[PDB]
Amino acid sequence: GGMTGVLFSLGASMVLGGVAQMLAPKARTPRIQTTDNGKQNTYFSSLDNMVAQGNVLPVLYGEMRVGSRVVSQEISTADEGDGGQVVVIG
Amino acid sequence: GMTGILFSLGASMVLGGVAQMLAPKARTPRIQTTDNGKQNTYFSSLDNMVAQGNVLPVLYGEMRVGSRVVSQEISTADEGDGGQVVVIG
Amino acid sequence: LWSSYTEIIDVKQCYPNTALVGVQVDSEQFGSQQVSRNYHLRGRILQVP
Amino acid sequence: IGPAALKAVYDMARKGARDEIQTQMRDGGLFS
């Protein structure tokens, strides 16, 4: 137990994947679909309304106009009324 | 003669979870971005599919569900279901 | 003549820590399809030094 | 001695397996 044989140095065994990978951990590209055609969406953009069923609530960090997750949509009859008494319908 | 290296493995199996040691656990499907944010069910298909790639499915109870359409065809109907009551005007 | 009167109560359920926007539009000049709502908002209040 | 030999074989069967994992996933293997 005094000695520690089999030092087993690791050099190119970790370089073999690439050198910038051992300084920066790289990024994950999304999966490409077919019905989506060629619109390569990323993981930090959403310009359409989503559905909030058993999903997570997204967060925003700066600028970059985004869509939303619809929680309630309803149509009723538009009653006549303003912020006052002027209610002419002639 | 002797049969050495038993190498008990009780510890290794728990590493993936203990509830899995008694239940294989249900499989889960993947999420398609194109299908908005809806979650696909593994045991129900409400939409009516096309009879080709999809294998002849099986039913096991209730579940108003769709189908696999084999033939769709639109033509001109007859004026009168049957009998002698065949008025037009 | 008088006609049916309706007493309405709004939503008492408030949202504790979620940002939200409510939009009401007459939706007459729009087409028969739905309308997409995109909002150009700023970021989140951070704990900056 | 026993335990030294066992630890040596165990640690020797580590980088071998790691290299096998890495080579079998590169171009035309089984992708680990």
Q: Which two tokens stand for residue A48?
A: 């359409």
Query: Which of C14-19's residues contact partners 24+ apart within 8 Å by CB, and which partners?
Result: C18/A57
What amino acid is encoded at B78 in this protein? D
Interface test with C, best of A47, A48, A60 (most C CBs within 10 A): A60
Contact with chain A for residue B36, Cβ under 8 A: yes
For C11, the token pair is 């939503």
Both structure tokens of B41 = 């069910």
* Residue of chain D nearest A1, judged by CA positions: D4
- According to DSSP, the residues that pair with B68 across neighbouring strands are B49
**Method of determination used here:** cryo-EM
Phi, psi of C43 (to 5 degrees): -95, -160
Residue A85 CA: distances (Å) to CA of A22, A82, B32, C8, C25: 71, 7, 52, 21, 21
DSSP state of A66: B
Contact between A67 and A48 (Cβ < 8 Å): yes
Beta carbons of A36 and B37 less than 8 Å apart: no
What subunits touch chain A, counting only 3 or more CB pairs under 8 A?
B, C, D
What is the C-alpha to C-alpha distance for residues D15 and D13, in angstroms, rounded to an integer? 6
Token pair, residue A71, equals 């929680």
- Closest to A31 (Cα-Cα) out of B34, B27, D30: B34
Distances (CA, A) of C39 to A1, A48, A61, C36: 66, 10, 14, 10
Residues of chain C positioned with their CB less than 8 A from the CB of A75: 27
CA distance B27 to B14: 19
CA–CA separation, A51 vs B25, rounded Å? 27
In three-state secondary structure terms, A50 is: strand
- A11 at the D interface (CB within 8 A)? no
Residue C12 CA to residue B85 CA, distance in Å, equals 61
CB burial readout A19-56, b (16+ within 10 A) else e:
eeeeeeeeeeeeeeeeeeeeeeeeeeebeebeeeeeee
CA nearest to A67, candidates C2, C41, C29: C41
Nearest CA in chain A to C21: A68
Cβ contacts from A onto D, under 8 A: 17
List the structure tokens of B80.
């009168």
Element at D7 (helix H, strand E):
helix D2-23
What is the rounded distance in angstroms from the CA atom of residue A30 to the CA atom of residue A36? 13
- CA A47, A49, A53, A58 dihedral sign is positive
